[PDB]
Structure 1
Amino acid sequence: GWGQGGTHSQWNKPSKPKTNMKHVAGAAAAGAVVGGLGGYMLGSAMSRPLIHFGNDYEDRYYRENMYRYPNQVYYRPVDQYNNQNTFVHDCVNITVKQHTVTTTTKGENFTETDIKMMERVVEQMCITQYQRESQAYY
């Protein structure tokens, strides 16, 4: 007539995490867990992987049992070329340019005029602004 107390356990219990950041790449933030027996596991081999939050009871009576390589993980990869990649390209290769190429041969008594006005061409770009009861003036 024994007794085990109930388990109220948290692998991650962050209370009121107020966080301001920009980039979360390959990481964990704002009270987040990257995988329980998992996550980013490109090549894996797990024998008898068990997750049970409930109570566990085992009453085992093993007699003369021949266990030959139980839960064996024969991890023998050959020439494994696997790609599981995350690519994020934001505002890349942005160009605001004015280019002029001049190739004049034996130009006599000639006038060359090259005017490239560039005014108020881009006022805003990639403005990741979060506003809450706020004001922004540009």
Structure 2
Amino acid sequence: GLGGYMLGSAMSRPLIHFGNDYEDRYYRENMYRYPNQVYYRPVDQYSNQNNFVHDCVNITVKQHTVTTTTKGENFTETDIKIMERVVEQMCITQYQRESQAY
């Protein structure tokens, strides 16, 4: 499950750009439904950024949808689409943080 995973501190949601003013307007009006912090394993447990990141995205996303759908939610193809993109940026930033403090 979440064995050995740490909850990172909250951060600003990354402003990810989409050309169509619709998806943008959608991410903006829906980011409150997405995470603003992530789950990660100590960085000394990965060989590179891509491994830390891939692992971080799957865990953060999963935990988020199971705990939020419990209270009442619905994540479409678009919601998942957007979430993985945003969480990935946050995971890469969480990576920078971890390696910087080492």
Per the normalisation by structure 2, the TM-score is 0.15
Number of aligned residue pairs: give it: 102
8 Å contact from structure 2 (residues 5, 42) kept in 1: no
Q: CA deviation at 1:82?
A: 1.0
Q: CA–CA distance in 2 between the matches of 1:122 and 1:135?
A: 20
Q: Deviations over 1:31-54 (max 9, x none)?
A: xxxxx9999999999884323387
**Which structure is higher in RCO with an 8 Å CA cutoff and minimum separation 6?**
2
User: Do the aligned partners of residues 54 and 47 (structure 1) sit closer, same or farther apart at CA in structure 2, a change above 3 Å counting?
Assistant: same
The answer to whether structure 1 residue 82 and structure 2 residue 20 are counterparts is no
8 Å contact from structure 2 (residues 43, 52) kept in 1: no
User: Which shifted more, 73-82 or 117-126?
Assistant: 117-126
8 Å contact from structure 2 (residues 13, 36) kept in 1: yes
Query: Which structure dedicates a bigger proportion of its chain to strand?
Result: 1
Q: CA deviation at 1:71?
A: 1.6
Q: CA–CA distance in 1 between the matches of 2:94 and 2:17?
A: 43
**Which residue of 1 is the match for residue 17 of structure 2?**
52
Provide the alpha-carbon RMSD of the alignment. Answer: 32.1
Unpaired segments ≥5 residues, structure 2? none
8 Å contact from structure 1 (residues 47, 71) kept in 2: yes
Per the normalisation by structure 1, the TM-score is 0.12
User: Do the aligned partners of residues 47 and 53 (structure 1) sit closer, same or farther apart at CA in structure 2, a change above 3 Å counting?
Assistant: same
Point out the structure with max Rg over C-alpha: 1
Q: CA deviation at 1:74?
A: 2.5
**Which residue of 2 is the match for residue 93 of structure 1?**
58
Q: CA deviation at 1:73?
A: 1.7
Q: CA–CA distance in 1 between the matches of 2:33 and 2:71?
A: 92
Q: CA–CA distance in 1 between the matches of 2:73 and 2:25?
A: 104
User: Which shifted more, 85-94 or 101-110?
Assistant: 101-110
Q: CA–CA distance in 1 between the matches of 2:88 and 2:30?
A: 78
User: Which shifted more, 93-102 or 70-79?
Assistant: 93-102
